[PDB]
């Protein structure tokens, strides 16, 4: 993107919905985006 290398990955977290009596395992999602810098390190 604009002549810079970017990484873009989907990442998952498991959360716990309550259903009351009981509770339940549930997942949520987020998109992470990082890019390389001029000295080869990543933001």
């Amino acid at each position: 993107y604009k002549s810079r290398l970017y990484l873009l990955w989907l990442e998952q977290k498991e959360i716990t919905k309550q259903t009351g009596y009981q509770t339940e395992t549930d997942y949520r999602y987020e998109l992470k985006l990082a890019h390389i810098r001029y000295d080869g390190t990543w933001n």
Binding site: R37, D39, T41, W42
Partner: protein
């Protein structure tokens, strides 16, 4: 004359020895040591 020729050869040995040390001032090893110190101090933006 033999006494001064041994003094001549002794001073010529030092002149060649310190001239060799001066011209080749930093070794391949001493250059690698500075490079490692420079690389160890370049990590501060990646640690941050």
């Amino acid at each position: 004359k033999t006494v001064l020729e041994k003094s001549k050869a002794g001073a010529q040995s030092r002149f060649d020895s310190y001239g060799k040390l001066y011209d080749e001032n930093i070794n391949a090893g001493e250059n690698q040591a500075m490079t490692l110190r420079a690389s160890a101090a370049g990590l501060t933006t990646a640690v941050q």
